[PDB]
Structure formats: C-alpha cells, structure tokens
Amino acid sequence: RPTFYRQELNKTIWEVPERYQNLSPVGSGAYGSVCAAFDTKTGHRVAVKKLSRPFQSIIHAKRTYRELRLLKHMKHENVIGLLDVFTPARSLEEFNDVYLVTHLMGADLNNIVKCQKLTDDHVQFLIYQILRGLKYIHSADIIHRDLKPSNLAVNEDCELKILDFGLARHTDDEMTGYVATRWYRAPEIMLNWMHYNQTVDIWSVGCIMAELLTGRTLFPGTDHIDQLKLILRLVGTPGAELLKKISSESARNYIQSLAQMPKMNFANVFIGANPLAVDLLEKMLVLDSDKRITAAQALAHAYFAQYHDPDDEPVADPYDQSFESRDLLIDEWKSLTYDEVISFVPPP
Ligand SMILES: NNC(=O)c1ccc(-c2ccc(Cl)cc2)o1
Ligand SMILES: [Cl-]
Ligand SMILES: [Cl-]
Ligand SMILES: [Cl-]
Ligand SMILES: [Cl-]
Ligand SMILES: [Cl-]
Ligand SMILES: [Mg+2]
C-alpha cells in the first residue's frame, strides 16, 4: 500500500498517493471533480478524477461499477485507457471514495475544427483513427452512445483518442433546444423510436466528418423536430422498405404527416470535397440503420488507402456485460467495485 497525503482544493478533501504531485483543479461536473497532476512514477502529466457520491443510490453505485469495468477493459491506441485507480480505504468497511487516473488531454476536435485550415489529408487521418478505435470498441459489443467533437482528444501530431463513453448519464434538460449534446445523435434515437445499437455511432462519425470538411455543424437543430426536418431534407423521408420495419406507432404517426422528400445530391452539398469523401458520407448517413456501413467495412474504403493496414487494426478481448441485467443492493455493487479497485494491474 502506498503512503497517502491530504489537501483541500476548492472546498474538496483530496487524499492521494505521494507519487501524484502539484495537484491543480481543472473542472467539475455532477459526476466528480478533476485535478491535473504530475505522476512521479511514470513521468506523465495526468488527470485525477475524484468521483462525487459514488454509492449514494442503487443507480449511482451501478454507474460507478459500469464506468470502472469499461475503463479497465479499454486497451487501444485510439481509446482512453486507465493509468491507475485508488482508494485511501484500508478495508471494504471504511470504503467510500474512488479516484480514476488517465493521461491529461489538451485540445479536443472542437478546438481544431474552429481554428485550423484542414487539408483532405488531415480529414483522412482523423476519421481513420476514430474508425480504428470504433472497430475495437464495437468488437467488444460496447456502444459509445455520445461521439461528438468534445469527446475526441487530438495532439500537435494530429493523433486522436476517443473518450467520455456514454454511461447512460444525459438528462432530458441536457438534450433540449439549440445544443451540441443532440446535434450528432441518429434520428431514430432522438425521440427513443428504437433501442440503442452500435450503428448509432457510425451516424455520429458521418456528422463529425461533414463538419471537418465544411467547418460547419451538419444538423444544428433548434429542437428535436427542427433537427429531424434538417436530417430528412438531406437524406430523404423513409422509403416503403424502411416504413415496413418501423415498429414504433409514435414514429409512423408523425412521419406520415410530413410531405415526401428525395435524398439530395451530396456532391452539390459538399462542394469541392474529394469524391471518395462524398461516397463514404453517403454510406454512413443512411436513415435505415441496418444499411449503414460498419467501422470494419469503412476501414477498407478507398478514402483511407494511404493509412489502412489490416494487420494493425486490432479487435478487443471479450467483454462480459451480464452485470447490466442483474438486480443487486447498494452494498453488493459497492463490494464488486472494491474488488475491481484492488485487482487493478497497471499497464507496462
Ligand atoms: N431497422 N430500423 C428500425 O427498426 C427503425 C425503427 C425506427 C426507425 C427510424 C429511422 C428514421 C426515422 Cl426518421 C424514424 C424511424 O428505424
Ligand atoms: Cl506513492
Ligand atoms: Cl490512454
Ligand atoms: Cl475511502
Ligand atoms: Cl461537441
Ligand atoms: Cl470481461
Ligand atoms: Mg465530454
């Protein structure tokens, strides 16, 4: 067991191993507080996140266990990994606090979209890396659920990592009105007309790719209905083949009210873009999710010819998510979390 030291930073007690020095607050949501630190064991600048109220309810205790399981599993160059996890508790009986340690990220994709002149080569390399990471995530039967520019870390060498997996955290208030939190969601998820599946992440990749090519949000809706109208004007209203599949009475009802529109010509929307970029966007931005390109299929598209290496696009170890359908008490979720903290082995 390492030695721990205590300090107060912005009205919060931080108790951390001596290896972590020069702690400085960086931000805080309702999920926890975050400090930047220097890790003397590894030489890395790190983010230390102290969870807030990790075991306050059954829903909160399960969410804590879900986040720790997911971060312990992810071992890939284009996905955030777990450097360390610790608790100052010496036993299950005094266990209350959980701290998570990752590499400190600087710029997100939001920063480089607003500010930099992107070549076609930049767009190829950035979207290649998102798809390489997503092939890995989807091979474990994990859905990200919240891909958007602020959840993509990028360095000076244009190297990218996926972060901030959806933990089923977002509220109705957070999705309301003119908000980036909704602009990258697939239309069938927008109003819960279908259950989440991994094809929803490819829709988000299409919205990010369009925004790197134009410098502008693809579907900046002022509310759910305005955003659906922007989507259907580009990709067309449902055809007979898709209508047949639509199980939700709610959806077919509102959709039959709208005048029919054809799919637009994407070469006239994305003026001057590489024709191979236009072709790949037509394969991602398909209303019928069964017909979208997969991450594994997209990596072999001629747009990525310069970067594609089928011997260096790895898949994940199997991931057991059976806990998701399990009914447990707060203290049982807390005991499972404690076992995962004490069994952690750091990376090489
Ligand atoms: N396999 N797909 C489906 O079961 C499904 C159910 C609902 C939809 C859907 C897609 C776009 C709009 Cl606008 C409305 C509904 O797709
Ligand atoms: Cl230490
Ligand atoms: Cl990492
Ligand atoms: Cl504790
Ligand atoms: Cl964003
Ligand atoms: Cl597993
Ligand atoms: Mg985020």
mmCIF file of C-alpha atoms and ligand atoms in Angstrom:
data_model
loop_
_atom_site.group_PDB
_atom_site.id
_atom_site.type_symbol
_atom_site.label_atom_id
_atom_site.label_comp_id
_atom_site.label_asym_id
_atom_site.label_seq_id
_atom_site.Cartn_x
_atom_site.Cartn_y
_atom_site.Cartn_z
ATOM 1 C CA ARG A 1 0.000 0.000 0.000
ATOM 2 C CA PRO A 2 1.467 3.447 -0.867
ATOM 3 C CA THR A 3 1.550 6.331 1.645
ATOM 4 C CA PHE A 4 -1.280 8.878 1.124
ATOM 5 C CA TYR A 5 -1.323 12.665 1.869
ATOM 6 C CA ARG A 6 -4.364 15.044 2.322
ATOM 7 C CA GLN A 7 -5.082 18.563 0.988
ATOM 8 C CA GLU A 8 -8.160 20.817 0.478
ATOM 9 C CA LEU A 9 -8.556 22.146 -3.129
ATOM 10 C CA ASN A 10 -11.726 24.271 -3.920
ATOM 11 C CA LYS A 11 -13.670 23.064 -0.790
ATOM 12 C CA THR A 12 -12.882 19.314 -1.518
ATOM 13 C CA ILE A 13 -10.535 16.962 0.512
ATOM 14 C CA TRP A 14 -8.094 15.088 -1.821
ATOM 15 C CA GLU A 15 -6.277 12.069 -0.310
ATOM 16 C CA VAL A 16 -3.824 10.636 -2.921
ATOM 17 C CA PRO A 17 -0.613 8.538 -3.104
ATOM 18 C CA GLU A 18 2.691 10.527 -2.747
ATOM 19 C CA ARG A 19 3.578 9.648 -6.390
ATOM 20 C CA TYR A 20 0.977 12.313 -7.546
ATOM 21 C CA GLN A 21 2.370 15.906 -7.095
ATOM 22 C CA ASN A 22 1.442 19.577 -7.953
ATOM 23 C CA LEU A 23 -2.377 18.916 -7.993
ATOM 24 C CA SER A 24 -4.307 21.820 -9.660
ATOM 25 C CA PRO A 25 -8.124 21.958 -10.213
ATOM 26 C CA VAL A 26 -9.208 21.804 -13.911
ATOM 27 C CA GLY A 27 -13.032 21.318 -13.713
ATOM 28 C CA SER A 28 -16.030 19.608 -12.006
ATOM 29 C CA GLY A 29 -19.452 18.334 -13.196
ATOM 30 C CA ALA A 30 -22.105 16.490 -11.094
ATOM 31 C CA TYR A 31 -20.026 13.285 -11.807
ATOM 32 C CA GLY A 32 -16.954 14.457 -9.779
ATOM 33 C CA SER A 33 -14.014 16.950 -9.571
ATOM 34 C CA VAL A 34 -10.793 16.781 -11.727
ATOM 35 C CA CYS A 35 -7.184 17.911 -10.928
ATOM 36 C CA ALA A 36 -4.140 17.973 -13.232
ATOM 37 C CA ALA A 37 -1.079 16.379 -11.550
ATOM 38 C CA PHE A 38 2.465 15.177 -12.239
ATOM 39 C CA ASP A 39 2.905 11.384 -11.854
ATOM 40 C CA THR A 40 6.493 10.827 -10.490
ATOM 41 C CA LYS A 41 6.356 7.020 -11.151
ATOM 42 C CA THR A 42 5.691 7.333 -14.945
ATOM 43 C CA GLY A 43 6.769 10.922 -15.821
ATOM 44 C CA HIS A 44 3.305 11.649 -17.393
ATOM 45 C CA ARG A 45 1.019 14.702 -16.760
ATOM 46 C CA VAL A 46 -2.287 13.050 -15.619
ATOM 47 C CA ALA A 47 -5.944 13.861 -14.867
ATOM 48 C CA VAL A 48 -7.049 12.650 -11.360
ATOM 49 C CA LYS A 49 -10.876 12.411 -11.081
ATOM 50 C CA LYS A 50 -12.454 12.060 -7.600
ATOM 51 C CA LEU A 51 -15.958 10.598 -8.053
ATOM 52 C CA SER A 52 -18.788 12.515 -6.249
ATOM 53 C CA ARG A 53 -21.345 10.461 -4.232
ATOM 54 C CA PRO A 54 -20.293 7.182 -5.971
ATOM 55 C CA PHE A 55 -22.555 4.911 -3.784
ATOM 56 C CA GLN A 56 -25.406 7.355 -2.914
ATOM 57 C CA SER A 57 -28.179 5.217 -4.645
ATOM 58 C CA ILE A 58 -28.519 1.820 -6.430
ATOM 59 C CA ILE A 59 -28.465 3.739 -9.810
ATOM 60 C CA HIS A 60 -25.253 5.688 -8.727
ATOM 61 C CA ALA A 61 -23.476 2.537 -7.293
ATOM 62 C CA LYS A 62 -24.199 0.571 -10.534
ATOM 63 C CA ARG A 63 -22.992 3.565 -12.679
ATOM 64 C CA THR A 64 -19.712 3.653 -10.615
ATOM 65 C CA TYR A 65 -19.190 -0.120 -11.242
ATOM 66 C CA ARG A 66 -20.059 0.310 -15.007
ATOM 67 C CA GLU A 67 -17.517 3.159 -15.503
ATOM 68 C CA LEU A 68 -14.677 1.257 -13.702
ATOM 69 C CA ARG A 69 -15.360 -2.011 -15.673
ATOM 70 C CA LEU A 70 -15.350 -0.128 -19.025
ATOM 71 C CA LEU A 71 -12.129 1.919 -18.318
ATOM 72 C CA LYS A 72 -10.272 -1.253 -17.048
ATOM 73 C CA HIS A 73 -11.124 -3.056 -20.325
ATOM 74 C CA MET A 74 -10.099 -0.441 -22.968
ATOM 75 C CA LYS A 75 -6.505 -1.142 -24.263
ATOM 76 C CA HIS A 76 -6.114 0.549 -27.687
ATOM 77 C CA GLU A 77 -4.024 3.445 -29.176
ATOM 78 C CA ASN A 78 -7.187 5.401 -30.249
ATOM 79 C CA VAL A 79 -9.181 4.955 -26.943
ATOM 80 C CA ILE A 80 -8.630 6.483 -23.476
ATOM 81 C CA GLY A 81 -7.112 3.909 -21.066
ATOM 82 C CA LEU A 82 -6.887 3.661 -17.253
ATOM 83 C CA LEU A 83 -3.421 4.530 -15.841
ATOM 84 C CA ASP A 84 -4.450 3.938 -12.159
ATOM 85 C CA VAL A 85 -7.406 3.621 -9.750
ATOM 86 C CA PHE A 86 -7.103 4.025 -5.960
ATOM 87 C CA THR A 87 -8.947 4.490 -2.682
ATOM 88 C CA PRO A 88 -7.446 5.583 0.670
ATOM 89 C CA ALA A 89 -9.649 2.979 2.442
ATOM 90 C CA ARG A 90 -7.727 0.068 4.116
ATOM 91 C CA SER A 91 -10.824 -2.288 4.064
ATOM 92 C CA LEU A 92 -14.320 -2.722 2.456
ATOM 93 C CA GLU A 93 -15.799 -1.491 5.793
ATOM 94 C CA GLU A 94 -14.181 2.018 5.501
ATOM 95 C CA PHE A 95 -14.556 2.188 1.621
ATOM 96 C CA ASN A 96 -16.294 5.422 0.434
ATOM 97 C CA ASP A 97 -14.099 7.219 -2.187
ATOM 98 C CA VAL A 98 -12.914 6.212 -5.742
ATOM 99 C CA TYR A 99 -10.204 8.094 -7.764
ATOM 100 C CA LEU A 100 -9.548 7.430 -11.518
ATOM 101 C CA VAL A 101 -6.236 8.432 -13.258
ATOM 102 C CA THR A 102 -5.846 8.991 -17.067
ATOM 103 C CA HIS A 103 -3.366 10.773 -19.417
ATOM 104 C CA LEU A 104 -4.022 14.567 -19.292
ATOM 105 C CA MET A 105 -5.614 15.641 -22.641
ATOM 106 C CA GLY A 106 -5.039 19.138 -24.182
ATOM 107 C CA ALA A 107 -7.018 20.034 -27.295
ATOM 108 C CA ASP A 108 -10.283 18.396 -28.438
ATOM 109 C CA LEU A 109 -11.520 18.237 -32.090
ATOM 110 C CA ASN A 110 -13.772 21.287 -31.332
ATOM 111 C CA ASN A 111 -10.598 23.448 -30.952
ATOM 112 C CA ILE A 112 -9.047 22.277 -34.319
ATOM 113 C CA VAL A 113 -12.323 22.490 -36.281
ATOM 114 C CA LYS A 114 -12.960 26.202 -35.368
ATOM 115 C CA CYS A 115 -9.302 27.376 -35.733
ATOM 116 C CA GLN A 116 -7.217 25.298 -38.259
ATOM 117 C CA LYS A 117 -7.227 25.023 -42.106
ATOM 118 C CA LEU A 118 -7.677 21.213 -42.599
ATOM 119 C CA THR A 119 -6.342 19.509 -45.753
ATOM 120 C CA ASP A 120 -8.158 16.446 -47.131
ATOM 121 C CA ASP A 121 -5.107 14.519 -45.717
ATOM 122 C CA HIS A 122 -5.974 15.788 -42.149
ATOM 123 C CA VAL A 123 -9.620 14.672 -42.579
ATOM 124 C CA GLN A 124 -8.486 11.196 -43.881
ATOM 125 C CA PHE A 125 -6.114 10.689 -40.831
ATOM 126 C CA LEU A 126 -8.545 11.969 -38.115
ATOM 127 C CA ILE A 127 -11.589 9.928 -39.372
ATOM 128 C CA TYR A 128 -9.310 6.824 -39.946
ATOM 129 C CA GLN A 129 -8.307 6.965 -36.209
ATOM 130 C CA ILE A 130 -11.973 7.351 -34.986
ATOM 131 C CA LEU A 131 -12.947 4.267 -37.113
ATOM 132 C CA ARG A 132 -9.857 2.249 -35.944
ATOM 133 C CA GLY A 133 -10.893 2.937 -32.297
ATOM 134 C CA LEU A 134 -14.582 2.172 -33.052
ATOM 135 C CA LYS A 135 -13.748 -1.203 -34.759
ATOM 136 C CA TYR A 136 -12.028 -2.120 -31.401
ATOM 137 C CA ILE A 137 -14.961 -0.780 -29.205
ATOM 138 C CA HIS A 138 -17.674 -2.486 -31.330
ATOM 139 C CA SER A 139 -15.780 -5.868 -31.387
ATOM 140 C CA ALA A 140 -16.375 -5.983 -27.526
ATOM 141 C CA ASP A 141 -20.167 -5.287 -28.150
ATOM 142 C CA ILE A 142 -19.728 -1.828 -26.478
ATOM 143 C CA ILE A 143 -21.761 1.152 -27.870
ATOM 144 C CA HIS A 144 -20.126 4.603 -27.230
ATOM 145 C CA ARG A 145 -23.530 6.477 -27.482
ATOM 146 C CA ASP A 146 -22.004 10.030 -27.194
ATOM 147 C CA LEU A 147 -19.487 10.579 -30.047
ATOM 148 C CA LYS A 148 -19.045 14.350 -30.708
ATOM 149 C CA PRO A 149 -16.021 16.691 -31.210
ATOM 150 C CA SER A 150 -15.638 17.499 -27.427
ATOM 151 C CA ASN A 151 -15.229 13.677 -26.712
ATOM 152 C CA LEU A 152 -12.222 13.399 -29.146
ATOM 153 C CA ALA A 153 -8.730 14.413 -27.834
ATOM 154 C CA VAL A 154 -6.150 15.468 -30.546
ATOM 155 C CA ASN A 155 -2.403 16.339 -30.141
ATOM 156 C CA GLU A 156 0.049 18.513 -32.204
ATOM 157 C CA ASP A 157 0.864 15.381 -34.341
ATOM 158 C CA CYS A 158 -2.912 15.004 -35.307
ATOM 159 C CA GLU A 159 -3.070 11.778 -33.141
ATOM 160 C CA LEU A 160 -6.597 11.111 -31.742
ATOM 161 C CA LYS A 161 -8.189 9.311 -28.738
ATOM 162 C CA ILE A 162 -11.894 8.567 -28.091
ATOM 163 C CA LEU A 163 -13.045 9.458 -24.505
ATOM 164 C CA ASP A 164 -16.148 10.028 -22.264
ATOM 165 C CA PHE A 165 -18.141 6.860 -23.124
ATOM 166 C CA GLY A 166 -21.936 7.246 -22.532
ATOM 167 C CA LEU A 167 -22.688 5.810 -19.031
ATOM 168 C CA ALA A 168 -26.486 6.424 -19.609
ATOM 169 C CA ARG A 169 -25.876 9.838 -17.855
ATOM 170 C CA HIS A 170 -27.610 12.531 -20.122
ATOM 171 C CA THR A 171 -30.922 14.084 -18.854
ATOM 172 C CA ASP A 172 -33.959 15.440 -20.918
ATOM 173 C CA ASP A 173 -32.926 19.077 -19.983
ATOM 174 C CA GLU A 174 -29.381 18.417 -21.365
ATOM 175 C CA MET A 175 -30.854 17.304 -24.799
ATOM 176 C CA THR A 176 -33.350 20.312 -25.114
ATOM 177 C CA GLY A 177 -33.046 23.228 -27.645
ATOM 178 C CA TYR A 178 -30.030 24.567 -29.629
ATOM 179 C CA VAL A 179 -27.410 22.211 -28.042
ATOM 180 C CA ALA A 180 -24.302 20.341 -29.381
ATOM 181 C CA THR A 181 -25.275 17.459 -26.975
ATOM 182 C CA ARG A 182 -28.031 16.424 -29.554
ATOM 183 C CA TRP A 183 -26.581 17.544 -32.977
ATOM 184 C CA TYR A 184 -24.594 14.243 -33.503
ATOM 185 C CA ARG A 185 -27.440 11.755 -32.496
ATOM 186 C CA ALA A 186 -29.151 9.438 -35.082
ATOM 187 C CA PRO A 187 -32.801 10.463 -35.793
ATOM 188 C CA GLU A 188 -34.298 7.087 -34.591
ATOM 189 C CA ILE A 189 -32.560 7.584 -31.145
ATOM 190 C CA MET A 190 -33.511 11.329 -30.984
ATOM 191 C CA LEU A 191 -37.045 10.551 -29.638
ATOM 192 C CA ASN A 192 -36.357 6.935 -28.436
ATOM 193 C CA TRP A 193 -38.103 5.406 -31.560
ATOM 194 C CA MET A 194 -35.568 2.490 -31.380
ATOM 195 C CA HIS A 195 -33.298 0.947 -28.667
ATOM 196 C CA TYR A 196 -29.553 1.906 -28.910
ATOM 197 C CA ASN A 197 -27.331 -0.306 -31.149
ATOM 198 C CA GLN A 198 -23.736 0.152 -32.440
ATOM 199 C CA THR A 199 -24.933 1.584 -35.846
ATOM 200 C CA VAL A 200 -25.856 4.828 -33.974
ATOM 201 C CA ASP A 201 -22.088 5.551 -33.508
ATOM 202 C CA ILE A 202 -21.469 5.452 -37.339
ATOM 203 C CA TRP A 203 -24.211 8.195 -37.797
ATOM 204 C CA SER A 204 -22.220 10.369 -35.307
ATOM 205 C CA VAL A 205 -18.962 9.708 -37.320
ATOM 206 C CA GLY A 206 -20.769 10.926 -40.502
ATOM 207 C CA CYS A 207 -21.876 14.181 -38.730
ATOM 208 C CA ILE A 208 -18.218 14.766 -37.435
ATOM 209 C CA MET A 209 -16.671 14.022 -40.884
ATOM 210 C CA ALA A 210 -19.091 16.502 -42.660
ATOM 211 C CA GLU A 211 -18.155 19.227 -40.069
ATOM 212 C CA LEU A 212 -14.360 18.677 -40.634
ATOM 213 C CA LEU A 213 -14.951 19.055 -44.455
ATOM 214 C CA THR A 214 -17.161 22.280 -44.258
ATOM 215 C CA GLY A 215 -16.144 23.848 -40.877
ATOM 216 C CA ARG A 216 -19.902 23.997 -40.003
ATOM 217 C CA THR A 217 -22.291 21.784 -37.917
ATOM 218 C CA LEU A 218 -24.211 19.426 -40.296
ATOM 219 C CA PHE A 219 -27.589 19.356 -38.389
ATOM 220 C CA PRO A 220 -27.665 22.325 -35.916
ATOM 221 C CA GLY A 221 -31.329 21.903 -34.895
ATOM 222 C CA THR A 222 -33.051 24.419 -32.548
ATOM 223 C CA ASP A 223 -35.054 21.443 -31.013
ATOM 224 C CA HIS A 224 -35.695 17.698 -31.738
ATOM 225 C CA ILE A 225 -38.327 18.460 -34.503
ATOM 226 C CA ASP A 226 -36.262 21.182 -36.276
ATOM 227 C CA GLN A 227 -33.272 18.771 -36.219
ATOM 228 C CA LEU A 228 -35.380 15.885 -37.719
ATOM 229 C CA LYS A 229 -36.523 18.266 -40.572
ATOM 230 C CA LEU A 230 -32.833 19.200 -41.337
ATOM 231 C CA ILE A 231 -31.936 15.431 -41.411
ATOM 232 C CA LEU A 232 -34.864 14.372 -43.690
ATOM 233 C CA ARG A 233 -34.194 17.309 -46.145
ATOM 234 C CA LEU A 234 -30.631 15.899 -46.734
ATOM 235 C CA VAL A 235 -31.220 12.044 -46.684
ATOM 236 C CA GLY A 236 -34.911 11.979 -47.784
ATOM 237 C CA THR A 237 -38.075 10.771 -45.984
ATOM 238 C CA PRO A 238 -38.443 6.997 -45.274
ATOM 239 C CA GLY A 239 -38.991 4.712 -48.304
ATOM 240 C CA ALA A 240 -41.549 1.815 -48.303
ATOM 241 C CA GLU A 241 -38.734 -0.639 -47.309
ATOM 242 C CA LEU A 242 -37.863 1.292 -44.064
ATOM 243 C CA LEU A 243 -41.535 2.145 -43.171
ATOM 244 C CA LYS A 244 -42.228 -1.663 -43.075
ATOM 245 C CA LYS A 245 -39.534 -2.050 -40.304
ATOM 246 C CA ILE A 246 -40.670 0.957 -38.141
ATOM 247 C CA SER A 247 -42.140 -0.801 -35.023
ATOM 248 C CA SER A 248 -42.915 2.455 -33.044
ATOM 249 C CA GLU A 249 -46.589 3.597 -33.636
ATOM 250 C CA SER A 250 -45.398 7.082 -32.374
ATOM 251 C CA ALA A 251 -42.857 7.326 -35.286
ATOM 252 C CA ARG A 252 -45.019 6.152 -38.274
ATOM 253 C CA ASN A 253 -47.783 8.538 -36.992
ATOM 254 C CA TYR A 254 -45.607 11.746 -37.051
ATOM 255 C CA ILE A 255 -43.678 10.625 -40.254
ATOM 256 C CA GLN A 256 -46.878 10.110 -42.389
ATOM 257 C CA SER A 257 -47.731 13.816 -41.584
ATOM 258 C CA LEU A 258 -44.564 15.056 -43.457
ATOM 259 C CA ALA A 259 -44.517 15.667 -47.270
ATOM 260 C CA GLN A 260 -42.197 13.183 -49.091
ATOM 261 C CA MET A 261 -38.696 14.468 -49.997
ATOM 262 C CA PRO A 262 -35.950 12.737 -52.085
ATOM 263 C CA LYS A 263 -32.309 12.240 -50.932
ATOM 264 C CA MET A 264 -30.206 15.307 -52.054
ATOM 265 C CA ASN A 265 -27.097 15.220 -54.306
ATOM 266 C CA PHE A 266 -24.178 15.173 -51.758
ATOM 267 C CA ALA A 267 -21.659 16.487 -54.421
ATOM 268 C CA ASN A 268 -23.842 19.686 -54.535
ATOM 269 C CA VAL A 269 -23.936 19.879 -50.655
ATOM 270 C CA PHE A 270 -20.158 19.188 -50.035
ATOM 271 C CA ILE A 271 -18.885 21.411 -52.906
ATOM 272 C CA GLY A 272 -15.202 20.730 -53.747
ATOM 273 C CA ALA A 273 -14.793 17.709 -51.413
ATOM 274 C CA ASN A 274 -12.803 14.623 -52.521
ATOM 275 C CA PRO A 275 -15.296 12.419 -54.435
ATOM 276 C CA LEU A 276 -14.172 9.420 -52.213
ATOM 277 C CA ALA A 277 -15.110 11.503 -49.082
ATOM 278 C CA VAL A 278 -18.586 12.215 -50.610
ATOM 279 C CA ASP A 279 -19.068 8.445 -51.353
ATOM 280 C CA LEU A 280 -18.152 7.493 -47.716
ATOM 281 C CA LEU A 281 -20.573 10.131 -46.293
ATOM 282 C CA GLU A 282 -23.448 8.671 -48.466
ATOM 283 C CA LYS A 283 -22.627 5.204 -46.872
ATOM 284 C CA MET A 284 -22.678 6.480 -43.212
ATOM 285 C CA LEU A 285 -25.638 8.939 -43.357
ATOM 286 C CA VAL A 286 -28.351 6.327 -44.204
ATOM 287 C CA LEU A 287 -31.676 6.649 -42.399
ATOM 288 C CA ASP A 288 -32.163 2.810 -42.159
ATOM 289 C CA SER A 289 -29.538 1.810 -39.563
ATOM 290 C CA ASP A 290 -29.409 -1.830 -40.893
ATOM 291 C CA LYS A 291 -27.984 -0.417 -44.209
ATOM 292 C CA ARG A 292 -25.205 1.850 -42.761
ATOM 293 C CA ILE A 293 -21.508 0.944 -43.396
ATOM 294 C CA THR A 294 -19.816 -0.677 -40.314
ATOM 295 C CA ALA A 295 -16.483 0.501 -38.789
ATOM 296 C CA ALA A 296 -14.712 -2.699 -40.081
ATOM 297 C CA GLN A 297 -16.151 -2.144 -43.647
ATOM 298 C CA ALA A 298 -15.292 1.635 -43.591
ATOM 299 C CA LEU A 299 -11.573 0.995 -42.781
ATOM 300 C CA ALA A 300 -11.309 -0.824 -46.213
ATOM 301 C CA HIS A 301 -12.933 2.140 -48.149
ATOM 302 C CA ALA A 302 -10.594 3.672 -50.793
ATOM 303 C CA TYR A 303 -10.780 7.099 -48.973
ATOM 304 C CA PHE A 304 -8.299 5.611 -46.351
ATOM 305 C CA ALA A 305 -5.923 3.864 -48.919
ATOM 306 C CA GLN A 306 -2.883 5.896 -47.542
ATOM 307 C CA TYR A 307 -3.438 4.690 -43.874
ATOM 308 C CA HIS A 308 -5.335 1.315 -43.969
ATOM 309 C CA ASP A 309 -3.236 -1.670 -42.645
ATOM 310 C CA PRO A 310 -5.392 -4.747 -41.981
ATOM 311 C CA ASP A 311 -2.536 -6.266 -39.827
ATOM 312 C CA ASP A 312 -2.624 -3.167 -37.471
ATOM 313 C CA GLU A 313 -6.394 -2.670 -36.799
ATOM 314 C CA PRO A 314 -6.829 -4.809 -33.663
ATOM 315 C CA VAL A 315 -10.005 -6.162 -32.011
ATOM 316 C CA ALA A 316 -10.774 -6.281 -28.262
ATOM 317 C CA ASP A 317 -10.765 -9.166 -25.770
ATOM 318 C CA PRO A 318 -14.305 -10.395 -24.971
ATOM 319 C CA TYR A 319 -16.238 -8.083 -22.531
ATOM 320 C CA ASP A 320 -18.817 -9.680 -20.080
ATOM 321 C CA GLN A 321 -21.712 -7.144 -19.559
ATOM 322 C CA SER A 322 -24.025 -9.686 -17.868
ATOM 323 C CA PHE A 323 -23.980 -7.360 -14.767
ATOM 324 C CA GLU A 324 -26.232 -4.925 -16.772
ATOM 325 C CA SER A 325 -29.325 -7.197 -16.326
ATOM 326 C CA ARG A 326 -28.515 -8.005 -12.658
ATOM 327 C CA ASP A 327 -30.557 -6.780 -9.645
ATOM 328 C CA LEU A 328 -28.284 -6.027 -6.590
ATOM 329 C CA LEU A 329 -28.341 -3.940 -3.336
ATOM 330 C CA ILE A 330 -26.123 -0.789 -2.893
ATOM 331 C CA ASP A 331 -23.606 -2.685 -0.678
ATOM 332 C CA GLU A 332 -23.330 -5.547 -3.285
ATOM 333 C CA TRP A 333 -22.497 -3.025 -6.124
ATOM 334 C CA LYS A 334 -20.031 -1.380 -3.671
ATOM 335 C CA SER A 335 -18.307 -4.759 -2.880
ATOM 336 C CA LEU A 336 -17.992 -5.562 -6.656
ATOM 337 C CA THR A 337 -16.429 -2.079 -7.214
ATOM 338 C CA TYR A 338 -13.970 -2.584 -4.293
ATOM 339 C CA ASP A 339 -12.788 -5.972 -5.777
ATOM 340 C CA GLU A 340 -12.152 -4.184 -9.175
ATOM 341 C CA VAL A 341 -10.107 -1.387 -7.426
ATOM 342 C CA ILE A 342 -7.863 -3.878 -5.539
ATOM 343 C CA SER A 343 -7.322 -6.232 -8.582
ATOM 344 C CA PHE A 344 -6.139 -3.363 -10.920
ATOM 345 C CA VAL A 345 -2.773 -4.066 -12.661
ATOM 346 C CA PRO A 346 -1.134 -1.029 -14.311
ATOM 347 C CA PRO A 347 -0.078 -1.021 -17.951
ATOM 348 C CA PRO A 348 3.568 -1.896 -18.912
HETATM 349 N N1 LIG B 1 -34.142 -1.132 -38.552
HETATM 350 N N2 LIG B 1 -34.676 0.128 -38.292
HETATM 351 C C1 LIG B 1 -35.733 0.310 -37.413
HETATM 352 O O1 LIG B 1 -36.271 -0.660 -36.846
HETATM 353 C C2 LIG B 1 -36.249 1.638 -37.177
HETATM 354 C C3 LIG B 1 -37.263 1.928 -36.324
HETATM 355 C C4 LIG B 1 -37.464 3.320 -36.431
HETATM 356 C C5 LIG B 1 -36.561 3.804 -37.373
HETATM 357 C C6 LIG B 1 -36.459 5.164 -37.875
HETATM 358 C C7 LIG B 1 -35.423 5.718 -38.633
HETATM 359 C C8 LIG B 1 -35.511 7.078 -39.067
HETATM 360 C C9 LIG B 1 -36.659 7.808 -38.734
HETATM 361 CL CL1 LIG B 1 -36.966 9.397 -39.344
HETATM 362 C C10 LIG B 1 -37.649 7.259 -37.967
HETATM 363 C C11 LIG B 1 -37.557 5.961 -37.542
HETATM 364 O O2 LIG B 1 -35.777 2.778 -37.848
HETATM 365 CL CL CL B 2 3.224 6.814 -3.859
HETATM 366 CL CL CL B 3 -4.634 6.387 -22.993
HETATM 367 CL CL CL B 4 -12.440 5.892 1.189
HETATM 368 CL CL CL B 5 -19.083 18.740 -29.055
HETATM 369 CL CL CL B 6 -14.983 -9.482 -19.233
HETATM 370 MG MG MG B 7 -17.128 15.021 -22.729
#
